[model samples]
Target: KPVLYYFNGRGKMESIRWLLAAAGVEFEEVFLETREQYEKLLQSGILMFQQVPMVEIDGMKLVQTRAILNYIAGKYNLYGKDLKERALIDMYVGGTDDLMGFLLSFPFLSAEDKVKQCAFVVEKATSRYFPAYEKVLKDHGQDFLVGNRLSWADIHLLEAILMVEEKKSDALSGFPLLQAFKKRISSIPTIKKFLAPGSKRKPISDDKYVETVRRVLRMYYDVKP
Candidate 1:
């Protein structure tokens, strides 16, 4: 089993968790709760870039979220069948990564900025990101993003779609294909199990999560309740 090192909140590690769960791989986590813990990890010198999302798996310490996810996806046979399919998966995952950037930054914004950022996130998601995916699904006429099987692209897209929906419940109302895509991918046994309560999937970042991140990373923000 892989052992993941990260803060208790999602951050970049959540996507890794989601990928692992989608692959039906069980793993353990070491959540950093204090600055000292982070310093200790840095002192150990295993982190390539002094990052928290390092994972110990397959006799190697994997850092960098994309590298870790690609390793898992390949090892678990979720990447794709060939280079062409993999390229398509990469394209879809890249778009989701961009959308995730907007969603992830929401927890650290000032109260006034949070409102503006929230609207921006929804606008960008609906206007740019969601439409492209809707077109792919509509044109390809497939349940999964790349090929006819579940792949890393589908997993990441489902995760991103849910994150967008968190901000606006009806974010997918216009994208009927995305609406159905979410329903289908989310119902997979492994994914469905991970979505249930008491799973390792972390919750949306709150004030406490932001405070912990600040304490661990020494990041300062003007956020307010």
Candidate 2:
């Protein structure tokens, strides 16, 4: 069994959690609930990347979100059918990192800065990634991002789309295929099991870390102050 380490919220580990659940693998997850716990792990020197989404399994400690997902994908036959297929999966996965990279930087900016950055990030992601994603599905005449069957790439893309939609309804409005893709993958039995009510997964009442973002948005758009 693998032991996954991450924060209490969904964040980066959500895709990994979905993949593991799909594989029916019995695993354990340790939630790091504080900055003190995070810093302690950093000081412990066990995390080579010094980050969460760390997996302790088969006597190996793995880091990085994609690396962990890829490892499980390989084990579960979801990586790809061949090298060429694998490259496509990687291409879609890599594209998402750009948007994710922009989003993960939110914490470092000031409240005022977050307002502009959040809008900029959303515009950049939707403008750059969504159309291309829709076209890929249209061209392939398939539901998944890579090949005919579902892969970790599909899960990765679904998470990205869900994040955007949660923030702004109809984020994928014009892209019907991509929207359907999210629906298709999310309904898998084991994946559905994890999403069912009463699971340990916490509902996101709000983006707590981005309260400044909310304040800035309100001030910028609603004149609520």
Candidate 3:
């Protein structure tokens, strides 16, 4: 059993946490706030990998958030057994990485940089990422990201929709398929339990950012359309 280092704050760790739970893995979580404590971790002599969230099982150590995600997904049958579906899941996960890089690769600096990202997002967000996502949604049509079963790619897209809500304003409007798909993910009982801002972490209840799902769902089937 490897210990998982976690902070209440969100980032790559939460994604891995969700993946582990969905896959029915068991582990302990430890939270550390000081460099000395993390440095003390070096005594374990187990971390061949140089990262905070390294997972060691049976003395085998693995690193990198993405690799961990894929490993757990495949281990628990979340990747789908079909070759084509597996490839599709891989592609969607890659797409999420691409979007993450695009949005976060730029460092936030002065107000000028913030303004630049705002404009840059407005100019490139929908054109650059949403279309590809739309095609994926359109291709699947209420099936999971790959097809007809839960997969890690579906998890990635559920998070991706939330990602766009956080970063790109109005970027989800044109991607109806992606948007509807997000709602479906959110409605799942497991996800609903997670979506609620537990004492551990809080999430926005109402915001235009959350509107992507609403807006996309509006295009296909109307709530009040």
Per residue, candidate 3 scores C-alpha lDDT tens digits across 1-225 of 656664333445566777765554566676555545655666775455535466664455666777777778887899988888888888878877666544442332235665676566545557766677688667657667676777888887676567667766566887777767778877776666667766233243233322332332232122110
- Model 1 Cα lDDT, one tens digit per residue, 61-154: 9999999999999999999999999999899999999898776767888878888888988899999999999999999998988889999999
Error of 3 at 139 (Å): 3.2
Best by lDDT: 1
lDDT of 1 at 53: 88
The prediction achieving the highest TM-score against the true structure is 1
Residue-level lDDT of model 2, residues 120-207, one tens digit each, is 7678767899898888999889867787898878877776776666556777888888878878988987767766886645444234
Indicate whether candidate 2 or candidate 3 has the larger lDDT. Answer: 2
TM-score of each: 0.96, 0.80, 0.76
Off by over 4 Å in 1: 220-225
Overall lDDT per candidate, in order of appearance: 0.90, 0.73, 0.62
Query: Which residue pairs come into collision in candidate 3?
Result: none
Residue 173 displacement (Å), model 2: 0.8
The lDDT, on a scale of 0 to 1, for candidate 2 is 0.73
Off by over 4 Å in 3: 6-8, 24-27, 57-59, 103-110, 118-124, 199-225
